[PDB]
Structure 1
């Protein structure tokens, strides 16, 4: 599913991301924009052989099982294919675990490089929330 900007903002808020660990909703929307262009089916292979899955590009080295990432963990206890669903629940739940892990949203390199410190409230502007 390709979300619209406000549609994803609303959905993220419904699923508990609105200021989760102190990150305002526009941070999450901005991260999803640059990780996946709001496409739940986005996948991208990493140099280390791991793969990133879904709207927030969650990686198989640590967080999900895809059966092809040697020496990896599955800390969210989910198949990585769950992260590609039209329903964002697995992605959101796993993202809450990631952002709680010590480095906050810096875990998403696209968020650090393209969202951090910018006017992220722009990403929810105009949206009925």
Structure 2
């Protein structure tokens, strides 16, 4: 599914991401835009042989099992295919584990390079939330 900006903001708010570990909703929408272009089916392969999955590009090296990332962990305890669902619940629940992990949203390279220190409130402007 390719989300609209406000549709995704509303779904993330319903799933408890607004101010989760102090990150306002616009941070999460900004990260999703630049990681996946709001497409739940996005996949991208890394040089190390791991793959990033779904709207928040969660990596198979640590967070999910894809059956082809040798010596990887599965810290969210989910098959990586669950992260490609039109239902963002699995992505959101895993993202909460990631952002609790000690480097906050700096875990997301697109967030650090494209969202951090910008007016992220712009990403939820105009939305009925």
Equivalent residues, number? 129
- Separation in structure 2 between the aligned mates of residue 121 and residue 33 of structure 1, nearest angstrom: 14
Gaps of 5+ in 1: none
Backbone CA RMSD of aligned residues:
0.2
Gaps of 5+ in 2: none
TM superposition score normalised by structure 2: 1.00
Return the offset for 1:116. Answer: 0.2
Return the offset for 1:3. Answer: 0.2
TM superposition score normalised by structure 1: 1.00
Alignment partner of 2:19: what SS? coil
Question: Per-residue displacement from partner, 1:50-87 (whole Å, max 9, x unpaired)?
Answer: 00000000000000000000110000000000000000
Which aligned runs of 4 or more in structure 1 are off by greater than 3 angstroms? none
- Separation in structure 1 between the aligned mates of residue 3 and residue 16 of structure 2, nearest angstrom: 17
Alignment partner of 2:52: what SS? strand
